[PDB]
Symmetry: D2
Subunit: 212 residues, 4 copies
């Protein structure tokens, strides 16, 4: 595509996109074009508006585009072209990526006892309500646990909510504790969002006892 400003828009929240170079109030020679999950290729939106799109995305008096409650299908590309009073044309190009933050992750079915030297089910981490899916990972006394690297194995599952489309992730951790290791290790799980610079969420720790 072309060079664009990246926009991250939280699902359910409003979004205002500026039409650069447009006069401050009507009359305005401007046009918006959008290609999103709602459209077949480009759809043109005008200041006069009208029709079913008025419920979804409307041009404001200052020429900006307004979406009262972003959904997953609004992901896509949004462009404006405007002429100012002098006649200079100005383009605006946005790439809109949508997201939702899940609830704090939880560990369910955690083991209270582990036996050293054999595989043990440690627990299952669950995160509900993300978009995009994101990922879950495990930590042992503050360091990342890497699957298939040192007696660690992980299985993962993804589900979607049938109406909202948001993701539920589950991750089951198994470990073989090394003989002579720490008798009260501390495990946690973290949710890492898909989009850049979004913060991780962490579970409360679990601390089983390890039998030599």
């Amino acid at each position: 595509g072309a060079m664009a400003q990246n926009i991250t828009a939280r699902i359910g929240e409003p979004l205002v996109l500026k039409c650069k170079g447009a006069p401050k109030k009507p009359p305005q020679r401007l046009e918006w074009k959008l290609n999103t999950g709602r459209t077949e290729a480009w759809k043109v939106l005008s200041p006069q508006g009208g029709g079913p799109w008025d419920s979804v995305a409307r041009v404001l008096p200052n020429g900006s585009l307004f979406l009262p409650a972003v959904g997953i299908q609004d992901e896509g590309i949004f462009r404006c072209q405007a002429m100012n009073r002098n006649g200079k044309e100005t383009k605006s190009n946005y790439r809109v990526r949508v997201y939702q933050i899940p609830g704090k992750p939880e560990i369910v079915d955690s083991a209270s006892e582990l036996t050293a030297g054999v595989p043990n089910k440690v627990g299952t981490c669950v995160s509900e309500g993300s978009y995009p899916a994101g990922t879950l990972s495990w930590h042992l006394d503050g360091k990342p646990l890497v699957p298939n690297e040192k007696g660690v194995s992980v299985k993962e599952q993804t589900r979607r909510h049938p109406e909202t489309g948001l993701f539920t992730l589950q991750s089951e951790l198994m470990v073989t504790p090394a003989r002579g290791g720490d008798p009260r290790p501390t495990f946690s799980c973290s949710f890492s969002p898909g989009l850049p610079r979004h913060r991780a969420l962490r579970t409360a720790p679990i601390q089983p006892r390890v039998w030599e």
Copy 2:
């Protein structure tokens, strides 16, 4: 995929899918699995049900799967596996395709006069509310008009309704009437649905005058 019974389901209407081989009433050893636009790969549904899926697809007392109002995202694959009283297992496999019938097509902006030997805009045919999109085509005195043959040109547009996802099609017809041809030709447009054996819908005819 595997061999399946093809199911066509109209958007907004209920759908009942039989679980072959299941006992007539509970208790029943059966399981449904579905992979549709709502799911991440296979989702399992059980007679006990529960959760947000109960609003979308529920197992009935006789083991059939019930969807009270099909939508576009229910397109996909639906399977049941059941054991009867004797313990014989029976599989059911369905491929569900969704559709909606548009309103009767209309001709807008029709020409009242055509000039023979030059290109003329005849009209624009519009169909609103189909799924899958389907196609529009033109006819002249009962015979198909083929684009790019014998002085015929057509341009087409597709749009989607931003909330329902249903398609609006437009088709603009241009013709160059042959000199010495019929002075009062009859044009019509037809909507052809995407799915097999669904009937076409036809516009009222238009009858311009042709000037030699």
Copy 3:
């Protein structure tokens, strides 16, 4: 999207798309833009060309766009904008749909004997190498057989070739012949292409004997 000329392009064959309004030979102020399965949104192509796109789609001396061998990923939208010597701008807008014709369909595993009044497997129809998938249907002495309508049942399967992406369809027909019906009925299967105005392909007939 916008109004476009519909283009149907056979997979593996070249495609030339005209840039309306461009000068006949260089120098030319024109630009092509395409959004297809190969692109992230719009890709711009220029008369000078260069790079990996030269292998796929190149501007010719007369300003037309040339694809030496269309593939499935070239489905999409192709646009040109040109200025003539006078400075008039002209736009060209194409919607390109790709297709391939399968081999003639065949009936395999046909029954030689049918018993009236009970269900019988009649045969399996197979079509290899279509795009888009298309559909198979059955006929009995020249009339369409409708699934689930009169002791007729059909099961269907779709597969894709792992390298070419082309579709193989299979359709298994079962019938319960009516008592006192024709002792030597004639069944056939037809392949119906997905795109408009493309011709159907038909199998050779089978003529089992029916036992009263």
Copy 4:
């Protein structure tokens, strides 16, 4: 879906997937099922093999599935079900995600001089050949530069190679240096891969002079 082992497979490299529980050498009662970009829903593969799938994914003597050179279309789900000599059934479930590492990112068109208190184009960062796309980000003397905070603006572009499908990313950085700040700042750009635990790649730094 169901619980699965996550597999990350580099494009162009072989992949071997174990069929847990299968006998060590033929004869073996096992079956693989896969649903990937190459398939229409589930495709079954058997030890005997045959056909065009042998070029893509083949069962080995020990029952493992072998792909000699993974591509983007092999992303998906791979499952085995086997019986051992005793008759115990074992399932294996894999979710295969594909990737490619781009070349080291580069800064092009870097500014040698910046003026404090006004916006300045700093440079354009380019990364070629990733899958999934990944993202680019900028740093100033070792700290992340956040777009739209403290006089920082970024624009981004994504393109795909027309034959390989791999992504090229570009990111253009603009900054307004604060008056009285460091006269010789150090900027760099980093590529962050899409998949978890893959390492970032960093450009060589640039050090323009800032004029008060």
